[PDB]
Design an enzyme around this catalytic site. Sequence first.
Site, short mmCIF file in Angstrom:
data_model
loop_
_atom_site.label_atom_id
_atom_site.label_comp_id
_atom_site.label_asym_id
_atom_site.label_seq_id
_atom_site.Cartn_x
_atom_site.Cartn_y
_atom_site.Cartn_z
N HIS A 42 24.23 0.08 -7.37
CA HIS A 42 24.41 -0.78 -6.20
C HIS A 42 24.64 -2.24 -6.57
O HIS A 42 24.90 -3.04 -5.68
CB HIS A 42 23.25 -0.63 -5.20
N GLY A 147 15.17 -8.37 -6.77
CA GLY A 147 15.62 -8.67 -8.12
C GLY A 147 15.08 -7.77 -9.21
O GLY A 147 15.50 -7.91 -10.37
N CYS A 149 15.40 -4.45 -9.43
CA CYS A 149 16.15 -3.22 -9.67
C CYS A 149 16.73 -3.22 -11.08
O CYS A 149 17.16 -4.26 -11.60
CB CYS A 149 17.25 -3.04 -8.63
C1 LIG Z 1 16.55 -4.00 -6.11
O1 LIG Z 1 16.15 -5.17 -6.82
C2 LIG Z 1 15.74 -3.81 -4.84
C3 LIG Z 1 14.26 -3.57 -5.16
C4 LIG Z 1 13.38 -3.73 -3.92
C5 LIG Z 1 13.39 -5.14 -3.32
C6 LIG Z 1 12.03 -5.23 -2.65
N1 LIG Z 1 11.21 -4.35 -3.47
C7 LIG Z 1 11.91 -3.47 -4.18
O2 LIG Z 1 11.45 -2.58 -4.92
N2 LIG Z 1 16.28 -2.68 -4.08
C8 LIG Z 1 16.75 -2.81 -2.83
O3 LIG Z 1 16.73 -3.87 -2.21
C9 LIG Z 1 17.30 -1.54 -2.17
C10 LIG Z 1 18.81 -1.44 -2.33
C11 LIG Z 1 19.41 -0.12 -1.87
C12 LIG Z 1 18.85 1.02 -2.70
C13 LIG Z 1 20.93 -0.15 -1.96
N3 LIG Z 1 16.94 -1.48 -0.77
C14 LIG Z 1 15.66 -1.34 -0.38
O4 LIG Z 1 14.71 -1.21 -1.13
O5 LIG Z 1 15.57 -1.33 0.97
C15 LIG Z 1 14.23 -1.17 1.51
C16 LIG Z 1 14.34 -0.95 3.01
C17 LIG Z 1 15.23 0.24 3.36
C18 LIG Z 1 15.76 -0.11 4.73
C19 LIG Z 1 15.84 -1.61 4.71
O6 LIG Z 1 16.50 -2.33 5.45
N4 LIG Z 1 15.01 -2.06 3.73
C20 LIG Z 1 14.74 -3.46 3.42
C21 LIG Z 1 13.60 -4.06 4.24
C22 LIG Z 1 13.20 -5.47 3.73
C23 LIG Z 1 13.38 -6.37 4.97
C24 LIG Z 1 12.32 -5.91 5.94
C25 LIG Z 1 12.69 -4.74 6.41
C26 LIG Z 1 13.96 -4.33 5.74
C27 LIG Z 1 14.61 -5.72 5.61
#
Ligand SMILES: *[C@H](O)[C@H](C[C@@H]1CCNC1=O)NC(=O)[C@H](CC(C)C)NC(=O)OC[C@@H]1CCC(=O)N1C[C@H]1C[C@@H]2C=C[C@H]1C2
Lengths: 305, 305
Positions: A42, A147, A149
């Site tokens: 991603h 950050g 990931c």
């Molecule tokens: C990569 O660095 C990151 C790691 C996350 C960031 C927070 N803690 C972690 O472990 N991964 C992501 O941001 C992934 C990316 C995807 C796999 C393409 N997304 C993610 O973890 O999303 C979590 C949930 C899923 C639905 C969503 O919207 N969301 C984010 C949350 C955070 C804010 C509050 C509610 C929503 C927005």
Amino acid sequence: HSGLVKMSHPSGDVEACMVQVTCGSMTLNGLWLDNTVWCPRHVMCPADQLSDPNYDALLISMTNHSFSVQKHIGAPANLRVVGHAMQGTLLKLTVDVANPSTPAYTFTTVKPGAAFSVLACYNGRPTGTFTVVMRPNYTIKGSFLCGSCGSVGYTKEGSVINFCYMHQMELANGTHTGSAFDGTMYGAFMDKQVHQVQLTDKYCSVNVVAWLYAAILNGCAWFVKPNRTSVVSFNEWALANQFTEFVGTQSVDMLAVKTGVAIEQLLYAIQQLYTGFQGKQILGSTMLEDEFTPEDVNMQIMGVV
Amino acid sequence: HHSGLVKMSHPSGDVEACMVQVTCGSMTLNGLWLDNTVWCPRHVMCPADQLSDPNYDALLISMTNHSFSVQKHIGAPANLRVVGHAMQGTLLKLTVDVANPSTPAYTFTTVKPGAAFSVLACYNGRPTGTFTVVMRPNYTIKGSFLCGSCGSVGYTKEGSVINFCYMHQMELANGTHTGSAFDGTMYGAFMDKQVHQVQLTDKYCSVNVVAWLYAAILNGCAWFVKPNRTSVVSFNEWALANQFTEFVGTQSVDMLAVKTGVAIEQLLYAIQQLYTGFQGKQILGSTMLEDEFTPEDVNMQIMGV
Ligand SMILES: *[C@H](O)[C@H](C[C@@H]1CCNC1=O)NC(=O)[C@H](CC(C)C)NC(=O)OC[C@@H]1CCC(=O)N1C[C@H]1C[C@@H]2C=C[C@H]1C2
Ligand SMILES: *[C@H](O)[C@H](C[C@@H]1CCNC1=O)NC(=O)[C@H](CC(C)C)NC(=O)OC[C@@H]1CCC(=O)N1C[C@H]1C[C@@H]2C=C[C@H]1C2
């Protein structure tokens, strides 16, 4: 004190493999081994597209020049990408220089109840290390921020590092999941930014047994009775009571021999303790503990690797 | 009205060109020859009188390259010289002097419970049959394997890329089978030794039952559909109490719901009622729920996707 702590492997060998990968406007961490850099796919997705990415088309849209790989710690380096591929939820970037600090390594998938070490990284810089158990629902109870990931999880057998986890996402309940290095996500999870059905967690029975042995090894055995529950009977009970089924190992057998307490005695004990500790404690706890493995107990208390 | 559903394997030709016979002493089984590597189960090194508790580390150290005989029988026959040997988990990695000229594009992946894959059953290095299975929730497969079948491989195919996911290792007491992924891990909690092993409880694969009910609807068999619905969350609590896997929807299931106009939640409700008995009726000629066909099987075989 039980003599048990959350013990990670020393992280130096893995620290020397960590890099920053940037693709356009996104950046995260990668793992540099031999001529390959692994990172979550991603990193290719624009921030306004993470809900429904077409990773196949994103990959076609990329060239080798679309990726920037930087090593920040130790001797810094910028690594020229000469090939790029997708495997499942990971990118495989081929670079022109082999990592001179590549350790002996393998790739392995970790199983529920098993422990591994995580090196938490941000912008290609290691910032902390901790150890988790893979939960029965294929999440981990980790500590990851934006950050992180591409942070990696691993075990070690001798000098061989067994990479088992690459961090991808945080679930709504605060737990975490990611990919094995064959590119599969653990569990039924997908690497898209959508809320997902996350399955029911369970007590890891083998780890609860290990912990009760750790208590006996500390002279705490008030819960041990002559009564026994067979593995088959316990496993029918476990299915009804949100416990994993118990599968004995040589590591558990070593605890049984050292203590003189049979596995079946502790399986009976678990069935009683699940109904309540009756105002008592085990190793300072009033609830069952399943975050320590039989290997943890053998190594940390008995010095047996 | 025949549903149009059959157990449909991939054409096996690409994989047949990769099978070899591997002999070590008086033990023989099959191996998978890709590039300059031959993969095979490590118990080929174990004397028949020692299979109950092999010391695989000691066995490997005692071998030389000359301990292994690798032969390709079908097609253009050849006797391949082993020039290196190593052990990865429950598999041997033998290095041979000549790269397989018929190596397909390939990856190694792990298959998940409920997912289907194709198996090429082989004896003495010679393919003899092909069939398809779904990985059971207890990490066994309901296969057809006899003595000498170890090293038979399972795979899926995405485009022209073969995704190798299974190397056959053993038969369990109940007649089911299990094996290794190509990271060398055994599926499930199993170990590659000839001893009694705890067999975890199998379950109905809910996503596949839903796929099969969509197949019935696509065939005009929809007497079990009602306005009533059960949410995924509610169904999954029920599933843990009724020996079903928890349901996780996918794009493949969604395609079935759109084509038929029947919501997933309607079929979750139907499953709950049908599980208590078909009330004397039949679905696609069956009086019990069928979980051996995947959402992808139904999309491909019936809607021609
Ligand atoms: C990569 O660095 C990151 C790691 C996350 C960031 C927070 N803690 C972690 O472990 N991964 C992501 O941001 C992934 C990316 C995807 C796999 C393409 N997304 C993610 O973890 O999303 C979590 C949930 C899923 C639905 C969503 O919207 N969301 C984010 C949350 C955070 C804010 C509050 C509610 C929503 C927005
Ligand atoms: C490899 O060719 C062969 C494939 C088997 C042969 C029959 N069908 C198969 O799938 N594998 C083995 O023989 C392995 C070897 C081990 C992994 C070192 N053992 C095996 O499959 O054993 C099966 C036997 C016979 C049927 C059965 O229930 N069983 C297990 C043993 C262990 C407990 C004691 C006796 C029974 C129960």
